[PDB]
């Protein structure tokens, strides 16, 4: 009747020993948590990173949010004090209650009532921005003089500034600019402010820490059910699935988990409270809303487990004509070029992906040669701005190779779309390539040597 809450997602309480290495721990829980898409992690009781900031000197510009189920939203001045004041009064006036007295069950039930009710037009506000000098990480960072307590947490793997640049992560090695993806984002919530159903770019992981305040309610769907969910959503809201001109135009929406559950899409929930982590796994759809005034911090990351999925994601982007945040192949080759300093399990896993890359590239080059492309020239793709090396047809970011024609200066197609560049015969085309196959096999060999050492 009305709202039936989804079953709870897994909750882990690691020992200090398990907690010592976040990537080992994530690998450990993966068999369980990937079945549910999201999971919650409670740190050991004494892991307590100090939060300190001036509520009057932290400023941000809030985003306005209408709360209508199935309505399209785009994916991407208050002080913290004045926002908090607004947020508390909003919740307090909404329920005619003190905020700590409003049961989380009630806020959840009411959220799903108000987004589905046409006659209600509740609007709320929220903050979402990357860490900057005007608004920095909630975790300790080096800058000016820090307390010993802050020093304790400076190097923690669970300090979300460090997570991107550890010895078992992959996004670290990327030299290309992916700031929107590798830097933590800060989120200031209020009652009912929400995040629409989405998956992370390049099907990466994400990890979210609620620094303080009232809980954040989550819904998650396991990666295996991603296409099921999309099919449900495309039937109910086809507008969200029209082609989009860039990454700054991704359309997303609020949708009741019971609707998914009715269509046999598995959905899990949780209330993330202050001091708790939520982890989302590759291609796991998630959404949620805040219970009240709060402050969270989140970052994307990629494990070695993720590498094959990363490759599959870019393939999927190609099929959908979606823009890439970075070139997956460029990242693989960057790591190969640093094989000697790579962690050994990383080296072994990159070697396997590189082997697929090379064999695919071989087949593509044979195919375009048979189409009559004969001329070729080496090209350092990584030097081109992204918007100068996207395939005309499928928008993929080129790196291994592309086709050009003097007919249309500056334009490129990837080797899947040789026929989509221009009307000139293929003998007028050039194969532009980053590496010969003969360059590539020794690169892969270096990884092998590092891996077997
Ligand atoms: Cl509404
Ligand atoms: Mn997310
Ligand atoms: Zn293409
Ligand atoms: Zn041409």
Curated annotation (Swiss-Prot):
A zinc finger (C5HC2) spans 391-443. Residues 152-318 form the JmjC domain. Fe cation binds at residues 198, 200, 286. Transmembrane segments: none annotated. It is found in: Nucleus. 2-oxoglutarate binds at residues 126, 206, 208, 216. Ubiquitously expressed, with highest levels in testis. Down-regulated in melanoma and glioblastoma. Up-regulated in breast cancer (at protein level). Changing residue 198 to Y: Abolishes lysine-specific histone demethylase activity. Residues 9-50 form the JmjN domain. Belongs to the JARID1 histone demethylase family. Histone demethylase that demethylates 'Lys-4' of histone H3, thereby playing a central role in histone code. Does not demethylate histone H3 'Lys-9' or H3 'Lys-27'. Demethylates trimethylated, dimethylated and monomethylated H3 'Lys-4'. Acts as a transcriptional corepressor for FOXG1B and PAX9. Favors the proliferation of breast cancer cells by repressing tumor suppressor genes such as BRCA1 and HOXA5. In contrast, may act as a tumor suppressor for melanoma. Represses the CLOCK-BMAL1 heterodimer-mediated transcriptional activation of the core clock component PER2. It is linked to Intellectual developmental disorder, autosomal recessive 65: A disorder characterized by significantly below average general intellectual functioning associated with impairments in adaptive behavior and manifested during the developmental period. MRT65 patients have moderate to severe intellectual disability, developmental delay, and facial dysmorphism. Camptodactyly is present in some patients. Interacts with FOXG1B, PAX9, MYC, MYCN and RB1. Interacts with HDAC1, HDAC4, HDAC5 and HDAC7. Interacts (via PHD-type 1 zinc finger) with histone H3 unmodified at 'Lys-4'; the interaction is inhibited when histone H3 is methylated at 'Arg-2' or 'Lys-4'. Both the JmjC domain and the JmjN domain are required for enzymatic activity. However ARID and PHD-type 1 domain are not required for activity per se but contributed to recognition of the H3(1-21)K4me2 substrate peptide. This is Lysine-specific demethylase 5B. The chain holds residues 26 to 754 of 1544 of the full protein.
């Amino acid at each position: 009747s009305m709202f039936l809450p989804p079953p709870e997602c897994p909750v882990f309480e690691p020992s200090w020993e398990e907690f010592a290495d976040p990537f080992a721990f994530i690998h450990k829980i993966r068999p369980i948590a990937e079945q549910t898409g999201i999971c919650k992690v409670r740190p050991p009781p004494d892991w307590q990173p100090p939060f300190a900031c001036d509520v009057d000197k932290l400023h941000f510009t809030p985003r306005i949010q209408r709360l209508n189920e199935l309505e399209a939203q785009t994916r991407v001045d208050y002080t913290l004090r004045t926002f908090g004041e607004m947020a508390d009064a909003f919740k307090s006036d909404y329920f005619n209650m003190p905020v700590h007295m409003v049961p989380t069950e009630l806020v959840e039930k009411e959220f799903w009532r108000l987004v589905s009710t046409i006659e209600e037009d509740v609007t709320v506000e929220y903050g979402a921005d990357i860490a900057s000098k005007e608004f920095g990480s909630g975790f300790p960072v080096r800058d000016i003089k820090l307390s010993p307590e802050e020093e304790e947490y400076l190097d923690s793997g669970w300090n979300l500034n460090n997570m991107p640049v550890m010895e078992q992560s992959v996004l670290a090695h990327i030299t290309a600019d992916i700031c929107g993806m590798k830097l933590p984002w800060l989120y200031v919530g209020m009652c009912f402010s929400s995040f629409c159903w989405h998956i992370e770019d390049h099907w990466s992981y994400s990890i979210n820490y609620l620094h303080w305040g009232e809980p954040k309610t989550w819904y998650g769907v396991p990666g295996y059910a991603a296409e099921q969910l999309e099919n449900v959503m495309k039937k109910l809201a086809p507008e969200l699935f029209v082609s989009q001109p860039d990454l700054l135009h991704q359309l997303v929406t609020i949708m009741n988990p019971n609707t998914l559950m009715t269509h046999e899409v598995p959905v899990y929930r949780t209330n993330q409270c202050a001091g708790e982590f939520v982890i989302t796994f590759p291609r796991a759809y998630h959404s949620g809303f805040n219970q009240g005034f709060n402050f969270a911090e989140a970052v994307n990351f990629c494990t070695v487990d993720w590498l094959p999925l990363g490759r599959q994601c870019v393939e999927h982007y190609r099929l959908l004509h979606r823009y890439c945040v970075f070139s997956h192949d460029e990242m693989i080759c960057k790591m190969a070029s640093k094989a000697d300093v790579l962690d050994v399990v990383v080296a072994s896993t990159v070697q396997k992906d590189m082997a697929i890359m090379i064999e695919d590239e071989k087949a593509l080059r044979e195919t375009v040669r048979k189409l009559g492309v004969i001329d070729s020239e080496r090209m350092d793709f990584e030097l081109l701005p992204d918007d100068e090396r996207q395939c005309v047809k499928c928008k993929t970011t080129c790196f291994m190779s592309a086709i050009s024609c003097s007919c249309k200066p500056g334009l490129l197609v990837c080797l899947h779309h040789v026929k989509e560049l221009c009307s000139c015969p293929p003998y007028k085309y050039k194969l532009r390539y980053r590496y010969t196959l003969d360059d590539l096999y020794p690169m892969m060999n270096a990884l092998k040597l590092r891996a077997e050492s």
